[PDB]
Design a protein around this ligand. Structure first.
Ligand SMILES: *[C@@H]1O[C@H](CO)[C@@H](O[C@@H]2O[C@H](CO)[C@@H](O[C@@H]3O[C@H](CO[C@H]4O[C@H](CO[C@H]5O[C@H](CO)[C@@H](O)[C@H](O)[C@@H]5O)[C@@H](O)[C@H](O)[C@@H]4O)[C@@H](O)[C@H](O[C@H]4O[C@H](CO)[C@@H](O)[C@H](O)[C@@H]4O)[C@@H]3O)[C@H](O)[C@H]2NC(C)=O)[C@H](O)[C@H]1NC(C)=O
Lengths: 672, 669
């Protein structure tokens, strides 16, 4: 009951090579294969490992100067850095074949900044079409310092310096135990000291490792600085998925807020104090992460120039809308087409497609980068290779900061302002003639917390001796949200014999007040649970769909220990290779309440139009003509949403066992 | 020991007529023939005597409506006043020949406001081709009230009211002495009575009479409101000239900051308070200059509409940056093109060339103007001719106000933003085949303060009696000013093949505030050009000696008019006043050192002098080169793609000798 895929022996060899660069990423083992291979890799004499001569020579130019030194923090949001990671990726991506890529990576694993190496390496593995099917470690196993609060990281460093536990009893009381000769450290989510306000209610979501990893995978599947020509016809839809990704994520987040009684995502101004502070429980080699207080004044001497830029970046968009048709980055933008939809997203992300070039150029300033800089609260960088980090400097920690959700809310509002220019769906575009949903039934929907382990060994240091055998076994254990399986049953009268699409969303039923949401105001608050095609036949029939089969959710990634165990059996975990960029399903449902929190499930059935065969960047691109998020991709006329083939069903989400995650990490106490 | 030049009969006569207009400037000598000419001079009747029929007629329409009254204070930053100045300028500028020009000035001296007249006349003498090579007095001799504090002014008034000294030994205690037939007044900088913040540390530079004269000349040489058609190939480089003047100045200013322990010019916001106040000790015949208190809220009620304009002006530029290529003001513009500096500079200046027109118009609001006005903290002008002056209403006073440096720093930074779109120079563009600088040595560099006197008589009103006997020149101001010893730069160069070469010398700081060595990457706009010249290299090894006294970019102290009247009787003219008048003064080349030797660096660059391709000699004898202003540091640098054998960075230290503080020169007993 963990999805398997069989896999042959040539595969095992290549997968083992790729996985091996992730062992002890923070130090160098002189007797690892990678070290020998890098010693033996003559880079000057290797023009013929590369499909692209320019990339090679471009790398050598920067190479001869020198790169970002080992041990410094890496972030693509600083330019000098970005130009280097991009050079590294071009090398990885234009390597003739696998041998070539492996020597290049070994070299980089040895001689280059570990952050930069891991960033380029992940992206290249996802992007190279000969590596497309290989599995990667979960990002929290590759960069545990981005996923572990200081408290836990310190406890582990402490256990290491002592070479183990003084005595068991002392240790157990501090949440430190041995299991099968490995160390396990119980971890709480952070308290009122890092989230000095109500946002702490939600720390179990915002600090969730799955949810942070998801954002990282999203970025690495199509990074802003890269064009999307690798993906064919998807190029003309890149901006669409940008909106969708953020609209869905914020919809997921607002639902968490509702169950924890927290109301709307706050709005703000660049010219005003921002309310919800955040003190990141992280440090880099030199600096504690930058802290932002409650009521932090965004508008100060240090951010004035940035704020001017941000301000006119948004107001330009207003000017576009005001005008309908306008000259923008080559063509005339007409707001009534869908070349408009694409433009809108590329505009807000300042991605490579906006400029219709291959890679983001050195002088093109991004809206999102400057926003993160203002909101990150950090002091200005010490030099081009040394910045003071904040949660917003990385996709791995971004979702920990309340400001992150506020910033994307603002962008999503802006896009929704443009979406006011889109013609709404008519009766005839949504009516499925000859078919009616007569009823929807759902099993009990139940959430709970349960423990979850990962190996954090990459954040622990090891002697020359211990390294000779790839040492690990430093596990973090944490209560994480989860739900039970449940089945949706859909009942249908049908005249016709066609293939059909069934979509299901979850959205709010009541606002923070107690009033029924009205669709005109709530369509942006629905997130997709599922999509699939079904043969329908006339009469009454019924489709059953288990939550374990929902399209947009995955199983927890396996740890590397387990990946290797499986490899020795010719086995690969499906969800880790066929769909890493997908939301973990443990977070499928907001945390419920013991009585049951009211949400609603929208079930929509429409005719299926045979759409060709692609191989797009994400799981969110289903083989359909339909816009992403359809029929909730755009403003609603409510009288058109009483279609026989639509059905809004009230459902309560329960919760069972302890309502608070800390109750799982108390020494002489066991929960429920 | 003042660089001379010889001169003929016709020259001296004209030059005397020209200098006649700068003495006793605020009064009229009934008996002087300039007056007899002036009173009766008929413009209508003389229409055939001007190159431009419509300029005469335009002037005439305005003159009947009415020009600004006399004694009222003149500033070009106000519509009506400026319009009258331009109408007057045109008339001077389109006079057929000298006689006509001379007479038109006579009329204008007699009939029109003093400041308006001198403003227009000064510019006219600089712009008229038949006038090229003539000499004008120093701005400080013409407008003395603007180059000195109240205390001094008032001592001058008191002495004049008493017709001398009631008690010479008492007057002595106040720094007032009779030296033969002169009254000499010692003057402190303002910090000697006012230390209302750390900016007052810099008064020996910001209040310096030469520096302030320097800005005035720069304005006059090519005022913002006029096209540069006259200067030919500089028309296509005007924005570049505007950026570079300001870039060089702020580097120079910054140097002064570093040596008094002050660091970066602070950023500001039209929507927030601005830190440092400005409390001017200048008087105007009619009013005090306006103060800005510390923490002054730039966004108060009177300023709402002003700030909306200024914020939009800026935001429109930020829009340009965001879209790379665009159409504005009738021009397709590409920010990838280095030539785009021309537009960038022209836009920030709202000059006539921005619009491809000869003169700017009222509806074309300037950013500089309204920025000046808001930061000047004045109340609303009472009407078209009655305003409360602040330092920034005049070119002769601007450098006094720390806010001025904040305002142009901001402008320069936006141009630097544009400059980020330019690709950095590669090795090949900079590398000088077979040429290597092997050593550089420099004589000791010492700064020091030294007394300087200027004729301040125009600040004073003489009696009918005194005007007739010509007793109009007995008031001098003595003041300690910055200076430095002359120094040689010894450069040793190697080259395979003999070749014609260009040598450039720059000054830049060694460390930031934290004491980390400067990367070129962050700091290429903090380099200040000292000199360029050409030499001929030979096969083998070369020794190049260059003295500070011969740097092309700086001038000598100008001579007082009285001393020029003396020279004209001998057929001599002060060379640096004729053709180098708008250069920075030599004595201000170096920032004030420290007793220990403050750390700086010399950058020497040697490159091939191919031929004379693109060649500036109409405006400035500055750029006889195809090369950007401030080449090779006119754009971003990558340290490792940049350094080549024909470059040398030498560490140097600037020392200071003698009295540290100007006021120690002004003590009695
Ligand atoms: C205390 O405060 C007050 C208030 O501010 C000050 O009062 C002002 O004083 C000045 C004097 O310094 C006055 O200006 C003068 O006004 C005269 C007349 O003004 C009008 O008439 C002009 C002439 O035309 C007339 O023609 C016929 C007559 O046959 C009539 O049909 C018609 O009504 C006209 O009145 C008009 O052209 C003009 O538009 C006025 O409405 C002027 O004669 C005089 O002009 C001379 O001076 C100018 C100086 O620059 C010069 O340009 C001209 O060539 C001309 O020779 C002069 O300007 C103000 O009128 C007066 N203001 C008010 C509101 O009353 C006062 O000075 C101050 N006192 C002290 C001690 O400080």
């Amino acid at each position: 009951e963990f999805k398997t895929t069989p896999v042959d022996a040539a595969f095992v060899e290549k997968q083992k090579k790729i996985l091996s660069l992730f062992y002890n990423v923070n130090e160098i083992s002189y007797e690892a294969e990678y070290y020998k291979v890098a010693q033996d890799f003559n880079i000057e004499a290797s023009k013929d490992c590369y499909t692209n001569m320019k990339a090679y020579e471009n790398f050598m130019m920067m190479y001869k100067v020198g790169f970002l030194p080992k041990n410094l923090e890496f972030s693509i949001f600083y330019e000098k850095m970005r130009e280097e990671a991009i050079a590294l990726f071009k090398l990885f991506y234009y390597a003739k074949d696998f041998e070539c890529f492996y020597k290049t990576a070994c070299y980089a694993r040895v001689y280059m900044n570990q952050g930069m190496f891991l960033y380029a390496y992940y992206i290249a593995i996802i992007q190279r079409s000969d590596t497309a099917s290989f599995v990667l470690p979960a990002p929290y196993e590759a960069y545990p310092q981005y996923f572990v609060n200081m408290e836990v990281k310190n406890k582990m460093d402490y256990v290491k310096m002592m070479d183990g536990c003084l005595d068991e009893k002392i240790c157990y009381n501090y949440g430190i135990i041995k299991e099968n000769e490995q160390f396990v450290m119980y971890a709480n989510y952070s308290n009122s000291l890092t989230y000095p306000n109500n946002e702490d209610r939600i720390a179990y979501l915002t600090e969730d490792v799955g949810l942070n990893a998801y954002y990282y995978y999203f970025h690495s599947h199509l990074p802003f600085w890269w064009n999307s020509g690798k993906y064919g016809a998807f190029k003309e839809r890149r901006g669409e998925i940008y909106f969708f990704f953020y609209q869905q994520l914020l919809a997921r987040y607002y639902m968490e807020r509702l169950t924890n009684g927290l109301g709307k995502i706050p709005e703000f101004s660049w010219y005003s104090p921002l309310r919800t502070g955040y003190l990141p429980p992280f440090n880099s080699f030199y600096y504690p992460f930058a802290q932002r207080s409650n009521d932090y004044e965004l508008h100060t001497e240090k951010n004035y120039e940035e704020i001017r830029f941000l301000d006119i970046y948004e107001k330009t968009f207003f000017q576009y809308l005001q005008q309908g048709h306008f000259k923008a980055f080559d063509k005339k933008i007409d707001l009534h087409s869908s070349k408009a939809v694409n433009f809108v997203g590329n505009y807000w992300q300042t991605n490579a497609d906006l400029f219709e070039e291959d890679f983001l150029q050195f002088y093109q300033r991004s809206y999102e980068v400057n926003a993160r800089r203002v909101l990150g609260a950090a002091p200005k960088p010490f030099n081009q290779y040394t910045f003071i980090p904040s949660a917003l400097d990385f996709y791995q920690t971004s979702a920990r900061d309340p400001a992150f959700y506020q910033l994307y809310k603002r962008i999503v509002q802006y896009i929704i302002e443009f979406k006011q220019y889109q013609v709404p769906y008519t009766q005839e575009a949504l009516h499925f003639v000859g078919l009616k949903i007569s009823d929807v039934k759902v099993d009990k929907m139940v959430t709970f917390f349960d423990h979850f382990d990962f190996d954090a060994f990459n954040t622990v240091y090891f002697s020359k001796e211990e390294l000779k055998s790839s040492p690990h076994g430093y596990k973090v254990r944490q209560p994480r949200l989860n739900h039970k399986p449940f089945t949706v049953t859909i009942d249908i009268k049908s005249d016709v014999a066609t293939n059909a699409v069934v979509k299901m969303f979850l959205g709010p039923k009541y606002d923070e007040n107690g009033f029924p949401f009205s669709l005109e105001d709530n369509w942006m608050n629905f997130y997709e649970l599922d999509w699939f095609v079904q043969k329908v036949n006339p009469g009454q029939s019924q489709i059953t769909r288990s939550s374990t089969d929902f399209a947009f959710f995955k199983e927890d990634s396996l740890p590397m220990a387990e990946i290797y165990k499986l490899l020795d059996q010719g086995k690969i975990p499906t969800d880790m290779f066929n769909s890493s960029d997908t939301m973990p399903s443990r977070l499928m449902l907001p945390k419920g309440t013991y009585d049951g929190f009211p949400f609603q499930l929208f079930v929509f059935v429409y005719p299926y139009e045979p759409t060709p065969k692609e191989s797009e960047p994400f799981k969110a691109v289903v083989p359909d003509n339909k816009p992403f998020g359809y029929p909730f991709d755009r403003p609603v006329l409510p009288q058109y949403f009483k279609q026989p083939n639509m059905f809004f069903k009230k459902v309560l989400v329960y919760h069972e066992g302890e309502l608070f995650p800390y109750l799982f990490n108390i020494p002489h106490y066991t929960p429920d | 020991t003042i660089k001379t030049k010889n001169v003929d009969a016709v020259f001296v006569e004209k030059q005397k007529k020209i200098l006649s207009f700068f003495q006793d400037v605020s009064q009229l000598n009934t008996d002087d023939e300039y007056y007899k000419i002036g009173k009766d001079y008929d413009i209508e009747m003389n229409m055939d005597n001007y190159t431009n029929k419509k300029a005469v007629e335009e002037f005439l329409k305005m003159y009947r409506t009415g020009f600004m009254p006399k004694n009222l204070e003149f500033s070009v930053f106000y519509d009506k006043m400026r319009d009258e100045a331009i109408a007057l300028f045109h008339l001077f500028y389109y006079a057929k020949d000298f006689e006509t020009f001379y007479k038109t000035a006579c009329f204008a001296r007699v009939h029109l406001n003093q400041g308006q007249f001198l403003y227009a006349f000064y510019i006219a003498v600089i712009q008229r081709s038949d006038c090229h090579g003539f000499v004008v007095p120093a701005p400080y001799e013409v407008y003395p009230k603007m180059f000195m504090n109240m205390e001094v002014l008032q001592k001058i008034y008191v002495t004049k009211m008493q017709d001398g000294l009631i008690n010479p030994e008492a007057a002595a205690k106040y720094g007032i002495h009779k030296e033969n037939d002169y009254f000499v007044y010692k003057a402190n900088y303002s910090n000697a009575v006012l230390y209302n913040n750390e900016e007052q540390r810099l008064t020996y530079f910001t209040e310096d009479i030469g520096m302030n004269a320097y800005y005035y000349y720069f304005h006059s040489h090519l005022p913002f409101w006029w096209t540069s058609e006259k200067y030919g190939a500089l028309k296509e480089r005007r924005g570049e000239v505007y950026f570079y003047f300001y870039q060089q100045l702020l580097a120079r200013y910054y140097f002064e900051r570093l040596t008094n322990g002050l660091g970066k010019i602070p950023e500001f916001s039209w929507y927030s308070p601005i830190k440092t106040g400005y409390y001017p000790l200048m008087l105007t015949k009619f009013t005090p200059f306006a103060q800005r208190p510390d923490y002054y809220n730039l966004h108060t009620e009177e300023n709402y509409e002003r700030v909306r304009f200024l914020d939009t002006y800026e935001k429109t530029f930020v829009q340009f940056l965001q879209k790379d290529h665009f159409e504005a003001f009738g021009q397709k513009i590409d920010f990838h093109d280095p030539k785009a500096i021309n537009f960038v500079g022209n836009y920030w200046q709202d000059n006539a060339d921005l619009y491809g027109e000869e003169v700017t118009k009222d509806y074309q609001r300037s950013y500089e103007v309204f920025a000046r006005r808001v930061l000047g903290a004045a109340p609303m002008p009472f009407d078209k001719y009655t305003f409360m002056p602040s330092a920034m209403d005049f070119y002769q006073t601007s450098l006094r106000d720390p806010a001025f440096y904040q305002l142009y720093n901001r402008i320069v930074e936006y141009i630097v933003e544009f400059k980020q779109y330019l690709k950095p120079y590669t090795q090949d563009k900079l590398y000088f085949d077979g040429v290597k600088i092997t050593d550089v040595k420099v004589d000791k560099l010492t700064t020091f303060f030294e007394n300087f006197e200027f004729d301040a008589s125009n600040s004073v009103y003489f009696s009918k009696e005194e005007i007739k006997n010509n007793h109009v020149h007995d008031v001098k101001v003595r003041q300690p000013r910055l200076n430095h010893s002359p120094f040689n730069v010894n450069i040793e160069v190697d080259s395979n093949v003999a070749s014609d070469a260009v040598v450039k010398i720059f000054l830049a700081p060694k460390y930031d505030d934290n004491g980390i060595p400067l990367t070129l990457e962050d700091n290429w706009m903090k380099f200040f050009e000292l000199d360029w010249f050409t030499t001929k290299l030979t096969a083998g090894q070369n020794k190049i000696i260059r003295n500070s006294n011969e740097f092309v970019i700086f001038k000598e102290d100008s001579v007082p008019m009285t001393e020029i009247m003396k020279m004209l009787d001998e057929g001599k003219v002060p060379f640096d006043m004729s053709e180098e008048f708008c250069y920075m003064p030599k004595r201000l080349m170096l920032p004030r050192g420290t007793e220990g030797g403050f750390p700086f660096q010399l950058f020497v660059f040697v490159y091939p002098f191919d031929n004379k391709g693109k060649d500036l000699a109409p405006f400035e004898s500055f750029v006889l080169d195809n090369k950007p202003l401030g080449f090779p540091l006119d754009r971003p640098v990558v340290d490792a793609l940049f350094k080549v054998p024909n470059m040398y960075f030498k560490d140097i230290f600037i020392y200071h000798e003698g009295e540290r503080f100007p006021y120690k020169f002004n003590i009695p007993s």
